[PDB]
């Protein structure tokens with residue numbers, strides 16, 4: 001076992017466990033009891049003050065439950081370990097696998113184990129709670145991939161050289177396999193990697209279906225193209241523009257603001273003077289593309305804000321610096337939460353594929369709610385960092 | 400015996416090296432007799448000069464060792480993290496007997512390597528002679544880990560007998576141990592003695608049936624029966640003179656009841672606390688506070704009881720609006736026969752509306768149920784799908800309500816107004832900023848005293864609303880008020896806003912837009 005330590009001075013996590021539903025508790029008991037028989041985990045005593053939260057998520061196309069341990073806090077307190085392919089995002093098709101099980105073979109430093117402590121809560125506090133800690137490398141922990149890196153490269157060296165037309169990228173418990181082969185040949189080539197993995201020690205995440213990164217779109221800002229223009233129309237037009245101007249300073253409003261001189265009635269239709277007509281058309285051109293000069297700082301946190309546009313439609317933006325969006329997109333349908341989770345997961349997967357990191361989200365929801373339902377629809381094997389917020393009116397309308 | 404739990408001092412800390420206060424020779428005398436017994440019983444063992452550690456002791460004749468220091472130097476344990484059950488979560492039992500575990504800490508070995516830190520000293524009576532030193536072999540009463548470690552043990556010790564007797568449930572709590580079954584009186588009283596035996600097996604002495612405790616179980620503000628439950632009988636005072644303090648307590652005492660006594664209202668009482676300058680200040684009761692007191696008094700005069708959980712049946716949660724800001728609910732399984740009830744005053748944010756507030760109540764109940772019954776109940780709400788959905792869809796924040804049924808029980812929640820999704824033709828147009836100017840030439844410039852930048856922004860809008868006709872388009876630069884109103888509140892802590900809200904309810908169509 002490799003000696004792993006927490007960053008210097010840092011102690012272990014003591015995270016509260018969110019109340020789970022009887023159903024999930026059951027799933028977890030079933031699961032954990034077997035992981036014990038197989039000695040992957042071991043009941044711990046009171047001498048262990050640490051604790052990480054566990055959850056039961058659902059497997060897509062499988063009646064089976066998956067245990068999901070929120071090692072977020074742990075990973076943050078875990079020492080760093082001492083390369084992302086820019087080509088991956090370019091492949092036509094990317095398939096994601098769950099090689100999480102690979103870790104269950106490698107033992108965890110007996111001295112670090114205490115920090116993997118987790119607990120199966122009890123209903124109504126009627127029982128103490130089933131406490132356990134990991135003997136092997138735990139899924140979801142930042143160490144595991146690293147420590148398994150080695151045996152991981154060895155396992156892939158054959159397929160990699162046999163199929164160098166294929167890009168294989170691992171992230172935590174996931175393996176990203178991208179290519180450009182025909183879709184049929186893909187799934188076929190994918191399936192082959194599988195048995196080549198079984199040959200050493202893996203389900204299709206995201207439905208066994210493919211991401212198509214190449215087709216990923218950057219939703220630019222858009223302006224209302226319309227027949228006749230009323231005072232209100234323009235007022236909004238000028239507003240939306242006025243805003244966007246902070247990003248693309250080449251935006252001029254002058255001529256439009258001129259049509260809006262004098263307390264006219266909102267509904268009154270205002271014809272556009274050629275001068276303004278062209279000003280708009282220019283503003284239109286400027287927006288056609290993302291503002292130049294926006295580069296990804298590997299050293300900076302990747303942030304992600306989501307907005308609810310109603311009807312099952314959402315808008316998101318990935319940036320590191322304000323107004324300096326690295327990416328933006330939309331998402332269409334379910335209920336508010338289901339969608340919102342699906343989104344985050346979509347936005348994360350991409351974030352990973354592209355930059356190899358997970359973004360920190362800002363969610364348009366009350367925490368108690370998110371805490372309550374999110375697990376009911378979550379399917380990833382990772383959990384991004386998130387915070388909860390209140391979406392400003394204008395900025396929603398502007399997307 | 401029991402598997403030992405390994406202990407350590409907090410990183411980079413040494414054992415307590417604290418000096419023993421002088422002790423009345425009469426006190427020296429009683430300690431020796433006491434300590435000698437403990438050594439005769441194995442609990443402690445005299446030690447040598449090897450050990451530099453020491454923890455102060457004193458007599459109360461009983462013994463007490465001050466472990467504060469040792470505690471500050473002792474590692475943190477996964478604690479008893481007390482989170483107690485709520486009666487509504489329990490299931491009915493035929494018999495439930497509790498056993499008081501005889502000195503359990505003294506019955507549990509102590510990690511060898513640690514014992515040395517538990518060292519203390521009994522001063523000798525005469526000057527030239529040294530006093531006897533000791534350390535523990537078992538859980539020291541008053542020591543940091545004793546509880547966690549004691550319970551832990553207990554649990555492992557109860558595992559076997561627990562899986563061997565499925566038809567039995569045991570709830571551990573400090574020294575108490577509760578055993579329940581739907582077993583025959585004797586057949587139950589049987590298993591009990593079966594247990595006591597198994598406990599004795601590891602040396603844990605429990606009370607005799609002649610001396611055990613039987614229901615009702617008055618525990619943590621509750622009164623527990625085999626088939627039912629409630630709150631310890633609460634009695635309202637009958638004073639002429641009410642102090643801020645008496646009031647504050649009463650209100651507290653009233654809230655407590657709310658979880659089972661529906662209809663308890665504290666508004667008028669709580670109102671009494673306004674302005675108060677001291678806990679001893681006498682506040683005379685208002686006429687409506689009297690009525691409230693009197694009303695609750697009567698509500699409390701009826702011994703209502705709670706029912707237990709039938710895992711078999713479903714959970715139904717019903718909610719009502721006990722008045723602006725107040726919501727009442729009751730979770731039942733069997734038709735209008737609760738397990739629990741409760742209120743909700745929780746106003747989240749300065750402004751809000753019934754739809755939102757009710758939705759928030761659903762989330763509390765939801766959260767609360769998962770904690771007590773492990774599942775969410777089907778809800779019966781006084782709002783209709785269309786209404787909800789209409790608010791739902793148009794709100795920037797995401798939200799989701801479990802499975803729910805509309806129950807036509809006034810008052811039904813609704814929206815007293817909605818903003819036009821598009822400017823109104825034929826309606827006058829106002830431009831606000833403190834004043835307004837309209838496309839029709841009208842204008843009013845008013846001077847506000849004590850206002851705040853934002854409160855000025857609303858006044859304008861208010862003004863405009865006032866002066867405008869049944870239909871109005873309003874144009875503002877205030878992004879704030881916009882948000883406020885777009886939110887569509889129907890109650891606010893700000894008087895101003897309520898006025899506006901009233902105006903809004905009255906109009907036929909209002910269109911609000913924002914411009915820089």
Ligand SMILES: CCCc1c(OC2CCCCC2)c2cc(Cl)ccc2[nH]c1=O
Nearest residue numbers: 489490492495568569570577623624625
């Ligand atoms: C021991 C199992 C928990 C449990 C009870 O024990 C109680 C637990 C809380 C402390 C007091 C005793 C219980 C007590 C009564 Cl009086 C009636 C029904 C009950 N149903 C139950 O599931």
Ligand SMILES: [Mg+2]
Nearest residue numbers: 830831832876
């Ligand atoms: Mg203006």
